[PDB]
Amino acid sequence: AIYADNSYSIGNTPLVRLKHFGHNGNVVVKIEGRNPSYSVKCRIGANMVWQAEKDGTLTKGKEIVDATGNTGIALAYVAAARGYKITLTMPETMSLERKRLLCGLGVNLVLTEAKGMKGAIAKAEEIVASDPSRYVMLKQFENPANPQIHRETTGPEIWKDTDGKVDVVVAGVGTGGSITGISRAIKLDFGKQITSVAVEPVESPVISQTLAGEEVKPGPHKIQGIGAGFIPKNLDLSIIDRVETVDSDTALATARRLMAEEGILAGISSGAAVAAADRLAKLPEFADKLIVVILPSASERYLSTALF
């Protein structure tokens, strides 16, 4: 068991049962912080590159370009690990204290000052425009290799570690890749009718609004990694059974409680996911149900944020 490079060691993350959440241990968490670049995105950093290699769009010479932060760091280490140049477009602004980290992974950040994603995606596209032959944009929000990896690793890990007893999957949605791949695995590959729960911010509940056929109005929020403010292609609505919304403050406080009461070094959206699972878990409906929660990242990515 020796990996040729850091990308092949993705996954195999543990399930830890919570003591201060849910009811008689029906809430268990999957620590995705325990991945090569320390978030769940390590899995898609690996597989998006591998697939691009496999179908010929990524080759020796061509530079990976994209806009993103956990996904940036994931692509950063895979680029380094497999020998690719990489440009990651990013604003000047929020989700910072991460520059020298990405800089430390040898990424060249397109120092893009209207500070937001379009400003980057414009520069991403413009860079992408400049020379199609030299650049490849892996497009996490829609690239099928994103959900595919969760279908093949994240989901099967959950099935095996519970021995087919998972009844519920709770996961924040950024790309939707995580919940989509997981659900497909458990429901379609293993054939078990579980409840898949997408989590999103109450500040920007675009999935809740869409399914209700209500006006889609997104907004700013503090739960880094989720709440994109649109329905991403890698989000398969068809497998989603329920959508829970959680506010930034409660999410942050849930993350702090995860540290102090559970000794689990969780990131902000990990708190969002737990707060929603705790709510579900305290419904008699879910009393005899095993609830599995994805904890996307880890506390030290958040030192300079409201979490601390």
Binding site: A120, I223, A228
Partner: peptide, 8 residues
Amino acid sequence: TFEYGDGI
């Protein structure tokens, strides 16, 4: 605060 693809 985060919004629209950034933070992911």
